[PDB]
Amino acid sequence: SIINFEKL
Amino acid sequence: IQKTPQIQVYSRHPPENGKPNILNCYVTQFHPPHIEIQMLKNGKKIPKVEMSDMSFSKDWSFYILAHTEFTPTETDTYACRVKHDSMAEPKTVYWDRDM
Amino acid sequence: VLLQQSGPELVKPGASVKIPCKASGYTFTDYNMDWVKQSHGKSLEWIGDINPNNGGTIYNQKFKGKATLTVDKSSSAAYMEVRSLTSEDTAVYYCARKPYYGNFAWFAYWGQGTLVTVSAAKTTPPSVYPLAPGSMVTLGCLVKGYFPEPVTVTWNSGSLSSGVHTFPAVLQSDLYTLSSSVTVPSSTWPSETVTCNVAHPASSTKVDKKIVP
Amino acid sequence: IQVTQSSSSFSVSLGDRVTITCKASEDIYNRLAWYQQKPGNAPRLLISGATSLETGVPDRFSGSGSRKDYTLIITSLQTEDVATYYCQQYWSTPLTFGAGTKLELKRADAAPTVSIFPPSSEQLTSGGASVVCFLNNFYPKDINVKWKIDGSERQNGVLNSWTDQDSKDSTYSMSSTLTLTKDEYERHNSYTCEATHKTSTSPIVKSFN
Amino acid sequence: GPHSLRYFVTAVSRPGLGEPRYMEVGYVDDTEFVRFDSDAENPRYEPRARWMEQEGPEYWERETQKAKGNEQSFRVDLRTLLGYYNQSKGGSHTIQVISGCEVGSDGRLLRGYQQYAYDGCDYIALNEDLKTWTAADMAALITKHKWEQAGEAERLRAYLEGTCVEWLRRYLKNGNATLLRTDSPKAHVTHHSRPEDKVTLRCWALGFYPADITLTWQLNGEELIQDMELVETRPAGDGTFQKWASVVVPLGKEQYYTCHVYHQGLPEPLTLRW
């Protein structure tokens, strides 16, 4: 499962 | 940053004349991912050239495999023509039964 | 830090409403604005956030298309529009701010929240009825058939408050009904007057009802 | 990621140690926050990162737990802690809250003072007839109210409303209204409300003819 | 044996054509096993390795839902980065992420990855230590400061030793039989006449899997690593790969030259003679 990405 | 595509043109199986084969066009090393790939027979565009899904590698560059069914002869010509923003004009690489 | 929202909104089924959220006391552009919905039935639900620099939006898949988030960077203001409203949209809507910029945090600051009521009923004034019984004597007032809220009720213009019970309103059909009870010493009624005062701002009506035996 | 609070309401005494559980559907790795909320106000942040007390929050508030099981602790319940409490995870998006745990003060059980009221003339002239039954200052909240017309029970046409816990004496109050037509009202003589409560096996009965 | 779970993310804007193209491609070791593409007819997570069928409907829903969330996030990211770099609204730009973990047979994390690129250039990456970041310019430093405020490294570290590990364990548990798959290279040597006087023999490796391979030319014992011409390994498009390696030699003693193929799916290195 891919991470939930943080906003850059 | 623009990265010039590199091309390889080759058969899937050993090229025996008058025997049905598949012709590949392996396009690696490009950026942006936006690309147009053509395949020519005797300088004439082959309609219905398949495209794999696009991927990219550990160095960020994109790669893609185009292919079409082809029956090689002693004397027919086959090329892959690639269009990309990194390039001034399209790039073409001819099929070499020995490369 | 302060996030100011608008007061109660009454709106009609199918219609839409736009809630403002004015922010002050911090650099607006270094944060996003999140919005949260609170309602009987699902409690608190997220909704989405907006980037003040470019209006970039992220929505809870649940609220995609039901809500639209916008930003005025220059007046430090975020707006949410809830469209095509059902009774399932009746709720209090908060704007809120994370303690920092990011997707994964908690809400350190909240706006006061804006209650949104979805109804088709038109303004209707209450009918006000006295409740006399048939040592300590309880008396009442029946406030029947009004829309919308609120309704105010006081006894003897507020002189009688200590022994008073006013009950949450209830939806009849699409109109409200409430009651208020008062307890006075039985030696003092009817000897001394006991009147009940009802007001309904929305319908511009004020009613006094003397409770007679 | 569902966040679940088991108890939706909780009876409590002043000075009690109170523990509010919060259960995550997946490991949320201590990314959990707790809010306190009082009626008519916005949620107020108590705790972040599971155990971290936000500035200004009193010392009697405490948090603990791991993986997917967390608790809010209030070591000695003061009167202004009577509120509803929410936990919120932020390990994954969308940020999701529990459904809240509402605290309510315990007090000795008390029987209501019951009063029935017949319809006013004013209402009757309009064709409507409401009978009103107040049940004031009792505890716990659980109560059964039967309307009986000439001996048998009326089910149809009743509206019930309770008050919040009274600030002064921690009791509850209820109002019951049976609305009938003038015609239907006049068909009968004896109107009664019956109140069964845990304070007594005998139901409190108010009537009029 | 070690194993890895990696995702290769790619979001590409295209103003004047609507939504940016978003994709999530999944890798166990080097084998693509899942794929989300926003442009597909039905944009869902799809299996890419037979053995992923054994995952019930909830898996695909959960992952699809999350991609859409990630998609939204990146959709904004592209604008922020536009601002950070003070760039025009016209042209198309790319964000790329590599994310995942390498873990040993004992279940300990060996290495964690989280690398980002904007327009083909390194933007920011999580360091070997899993606590600190390397920003590659002044735009990336703004991201860097935000992530330190937010406690992003710690979060990643939580995912990389926890989440990432446990899913890999399952992913291995599911298709471990299939991922061992090796296809031995079938080799031949080809002769080519040249002008002048010299000749070049070309050593072929055909129909092999996985792609890791080594080809060497040696004069009766000593290998030539300076005169060797080689092509990059390439797919036949049937699943297998191909590569060749050639060398220039004097005419007469081409039998004196031997080709060597080294591949993990071969009991012994192939040693070929013309």
Do D46 and D54 meet the contact criterion of CB atoms below 8 Å apart? yes
C162's tokens: 């200590």
Across the interface, which of E67, E76, E163 has its CB nearest the CB of A7?
E76
Where are the domains positioned within chain B? 1-99
Angstrom distance (rounded) from CA D128 to CA D136: 25
Rounded Cα gap, residues E234 and C80, in angstroms: 53
Q: What is the DSSP string of B39-70?
A: EEETTEE-S--EEPPPEE-TTS-EEEEEEEEE
Three-point CA angle E20, C95, D58, nearest 5°: 125
- Reading the block at residue A4, the tokens are 């939930």
Q: Which of D209, D136, D143, D129 is nearest to D177 (CA)?
A: D129
Q: Do E162 and D94 touch (CB under 8 A)?
A: no
Helix (H, G, I), strand (E, B) or coil at E153: helix
For residue E140, give the DSSP letter. Answer: H
Q: From the list E79, E82, E149, which residue is nearest C100 (CB)?
A: E149
CA dihedral B68→B71→B76→B82, nearest 10 degrees, is 10
User: In this structure, are residues E238 and B12 in contact, taking their beta carbons and an 8 Å threshold?
Assistant: yes
CB contact under 8 A, D100 and C43: yes
| D10 shares its domain with D60 | yes
The verdict on a CB contact (< 8 Å) between E70 and A6 is no
Residue E106 exposed, middle or buried by CB count within 10 Å (0-12, 13-18, 19+): exposed
SS (H, E, C) C75-133: CCEEEEEECCCCHHHCEEEEEEECCCCCCCCCCCEECCCEEEEECCCCCECCEEEEECC
| Cα(C191)–Cα(C211) distance, integer angstroms | 11
Contacts of A7 in chain E (CB under 8 A): 73, 76-77, 80, 146
Together in a domain, D112 and D64: no
| CA–CA dist E102, E112 (Å, integer) | 6
Q: What is the resolution of this structure in A?
A: 2.9
Q: Residue E138, SS3?
A: helix
Tell me, yes or no, whether D160 and D87 share the same domain: no
Which chain A residues are closer than 8 Å to C56 by Cβ?
none
CB-based contact (8 Å) between A3 and chain C?
no
We report the CATH number of the domain holding residue D133 as: 2.60.40.10
Distance CA E110, CA E169 (A): 14
Q: Please give the DSSP secondary-structure letter assigned to residue D186.
A: H
Residues D136 and D182 in one domain: yes
* Region for residue B29 given its phi and psi (left: phi exceeds 0; alpha: psi -120 to 50; beta: otherwise): left
Between the CA of residue D80 and those of B86, C182, D74, D83, D105, what are the distances in Å? 68, 27, 12, 8, 11
Give D99's contacts in chain C (Cβ within 8 Å).
43
Tracing tokens 């695909």 back to the chain, one arrives at E60
A5/C102 Cβ within 8 A = no
Distance, C-alpha E185 to centroid of its chain: 21
Whole-angstrom CA distances from C165 to B28, C141, C181, D83, D175 are 79, 10, 5, 21, 9
Mark which residues 81-120 of E lie under 8 Å from C by CB.
82-83
Which one, of E220, E221, E192, E186, lies nearest residue E204 by Cα?
A: E186
Distances (CA, A) of E109 to A3, B90, C185, E2, E159: 16, 46, 78, 10, 11
Positive or negative: CA dihedral E88, E92, E94, E95: positive
DSSP annotation of B31: B
User: Maximum CA pair distance of chain C?
Assistant: 72
**DSSP 8-state secondary structure symbol assigned to residue E162:** I
Cβ E237 vs Cβ B67: under 8 Å: yes
Give the residue carrying structure tokens 């798959």: E181
Give chain D's length: 209
What is the radius of gyration, based on Cα positions, of chain C? 23
The CA distance from E117 to the nearest CA of chain B, in Å, is 7
DSSP E166-219: HHHHHHHHHHHHHHT--BPPEEEEEEEE-SSS-EEEEEEEEEEBSS--EEEEEE
Neighbours of E32 (CB within 10 A): 15
User: For the stretch C9-44, what's the b/e string if a residue is b when 16 or more beta carbons lie within 10 angstroms of its beta carbon?
Assistant: ebbeeeeebebbbbbeeeebeebbbbbbbbbeeebb
Please indicate if any CB of chain E lies within 8 Å of the CB of D29: yes
- The verdict on a CB contact (< 8 Å) between C133 and D115 is yes
| Chain A residues close to C101, C-beta within 8 Å | 7
CB burial string C67-84: b at 16+ within 10 A, e below: bbbebeeeebbbbbebee
Residues in contact with E24: Cβ distance below 8 Å, sequence separation at least 6, in sequence order: A2, E7, E8, E9, E34, E35, E36, E45, E67, E70
Closest alpha carbon to E81 in C56, C77, B33, B58: C56
E160 vs E145: CA distance, rounded Å:
21
Look at residue D40 and give its three-state secondary structure: coil
- DSSP 3-state of D64: strand
Could you tell me the domains of chain C? 1-120 (2.60.40.10), 121-213 (2.60.40.10)
Q: Which residues contact D83 (CB under 8 A, 6 or more apart)?
A: D36, D37, D38, D102, D103
Residue ranges of the alpha helices (H) in chain D? Answer: 121-124, 182-186
The backbone torsions φ and ψ at residue C183, rounded to the nearest 5 degrees and listed phi first, read -115, 120
CB C56 within 8 A of CB C47: no
Whether residues E26 and A5 touch (CB distance < 8 A) is answered with: no
Domain that holds residue D169: 108-209
Amino acid identity of residue C155, one-letter, is W
**Tokens 């039964």, located at residue:** B97
Q: What's the one-letter identity of residue E171?
A: Y
Residue of C nearest to A7 (CA): C102
Domain termination residue (choose one: D107, D138, D155): D107
Which H or E element spans position E141?
Answer: helix E138-150
CA atoms within 13 A on the CB side of D21: 9
D103 shares its domain with D119: no
Residues D47 and D77 in one domain: yes
Structure tokens at B83: 């269009």
Assigned superfamily of B1-99: Immunoglobulins (2.60.40.10)
- Domain final residue, candidates D60, D79, D107: D107
DSSP-based three-state secondary structure for E105: coil
Secondary structure (H, E, C), chain C = CEEEECCCEEECCCCCEEEEEEEECCCHHHCCEEEEEEECCCEEEEEEEECCCCCCEEECCCCECCEEEEEECCCCEEEEEECCCCHHHCEEEEEEECCCCCCCCCCCEECCCEEEEECCCCCECCEEEEECCCCCCEEEEEEEEEECCCCEEEEHHHCECCCEEECCCEECCCCEEEEEEEECCHHHCCCCCCEEEEEEHHHCEEEEEECCC
The CA-atom distances, in angstroms, between E227 and each of E217, E233, E246, E251, E271 are: 9, 19, 9, 16, 19
Contacts of E160 (CB under 8 A, 6+ apart): E101, E109, E112, E114, E130
* Chain C residues touching E83 at Cβ < 8 A: 53-54
Check E26 against A8: CB less than 8 A apart. Answer: no
How do the residues of chain A divide into helix, strand and coil, expressed in percent and rounded to 5? 0, 0, 100
Same-domain pairing of D59 and D126: no
E141-to-C101, C119, E85, E133 alpha-carbon distances in Å:
15, 51, 12, 9
Instruction: Give me B57's structure tokens.
Output: 């590698």
Q: How far apart are CA C104 and CA C46, in angstroms?
A: 12
Q: How many residues does chain C have?
A: 213
Q: Which residues pair with C125 in a beta bridge?
A: none
Q: Which candidate, D31, D29, D64, D34, places its Cα nearest to that of D47? A: D34
Residues sharing a CB contact under 8 Å with residue D134, sequence separation 6 or more, in sequence order: C138, C140, C165, C179, C181, D114, D115, D117, D173, D174, D175, D176
Query: Is the separation of the CB atoms in C186 and D113 below 8 Å?
Result: no
CB distance E96–B60 less than 8 Å? yes
User: How far is B31 from B37, CA to CA, in rounded Å?
Assistant: 14
Beta bridge partners of C155: C160, C196
The count of structural domains within chain D is 2
Spatial distance between the Cα atoms of E158 and C213, rounded to a whole number of angstroms: 74
**Distance between first and last Cα of chain C:** 56
Q: Quick one: tokens of E249?
A: 């030699």
Q: How far is A5 from chain E (nearest CA, A)?
A: 6
Answer for the pair C56, C48: CB distance below 8 angstroms, yes or no: no
Length of chain B: 99
d(CA B36, CA C12): 53
Q: Which residues pair with residue E262 across a beta bridge? A: E214
**According to CATH, what is the number of the domain E182-272?**
2.60.40.10
Are E27 and E6 contacting, i.e. CB atoms less than 8 angstroms apart? yes
Alpha-carbon distances of D181 from C128, D157, E51, E183, rounded to whole Å = 17, 10, 70, 88
Backbone angles phi, psi at E170, to 5 degrees: -65, -50
Domain E1-181, CATH homologous superfamily name and number: MHC class I-like antigen recognition-like (3.30.500.10)
Measured CA angle at E27 (ends E22, E30), to 5 deg: 130
D128 bridge partner residues: D181
Contact, E11 vs E118, CB < 8 A? no
- Give the end-to-end CA distance of chain B in Å, rounded to a whole number: 31
DSSP state for residue B17 in the 8-state scheme: T
Q: What is the DSSP letter of D126?
A: T
Chain B residues within 8 angstroms (CB to CB) of chain E: 1-3, 6, 8, 10, 12-14, 22, 24, 26, 28, 31-34, 52-53, 55-56, 58, 60-61, 65, 67, 98-99
Q: DSSP code of D81?
A: G
D66, β-bridge pairs:
D69
Encoding tokens for residue E181?
């798959």
Q: How far is residue E28's CA from residue E48's CA, in Å, rounded to a whole number?
A: 11
Within 10 angstroms of residue E127's Cβ, the number of other Cβ atoms is: 12
Are E76 and C105 inside 8 Å of each other by CB?
no
CA distance D94 to chain E (A): 8
DSSP label of E52: G
Cα E126 to Cα E139: distance, rounded to the nearest angstrom? 16
Of E23, E7, E15, E18, the residue nearest E95 (C-alpha): E23
Contacts of D177 in chain C (CB under 8 A): 142, 177, 179
What one-character DSSP code corresponds to residue E161?
I
Last residue of a domain, one of D88, D107, D126: D107
Contact (CB, 8 A) for E196 and E244: no
